[PDB]
Amino acid sequence: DAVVGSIAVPSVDVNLLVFKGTNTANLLAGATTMRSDQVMGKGNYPLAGHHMRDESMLFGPIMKVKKGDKIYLTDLENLYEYTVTETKTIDETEVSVIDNTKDARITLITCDKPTETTKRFVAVGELEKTEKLTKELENKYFPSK
User: Fold this and answer.
1) Which residue of 41, 88, 96, 107 lies most exposed, with the fewest beta carbons within 10 A?
2) Which residues are identified as catalytic?
3) 27 is in which domain, residue-wise?
């Protein structure tokens, strides 16, 4: 499989699998990494997720994310907790929001519409804490089916 872990935003009912690489195959599977080099809990961790007509799917609901909602990320070894600090709409050409940073952060990227658009909604969250993933934490923040 191409799964590397999970991401969860409980305030907007987002609970998805994280895939390695943003390609046409992984488009509807879940959240997808955008750089080959990005590491969880370190630098910038950009993730892309499609905005479908069904607003509840994938990264659709992160349109309604506010600061400072929690974003949970895991590689099934560690639980990485981020806190939303900025939400914005940008043009798709502004690739700068994908680049790595010195601060530990997560960058959620989705289309601002389910239709064709050159505009992207971006949610940035700063890392607040890191801890070992346990059964209880996994089931709490990344719960099943």
Assistant:
1) 96
2) 50, 111
3) 1-145
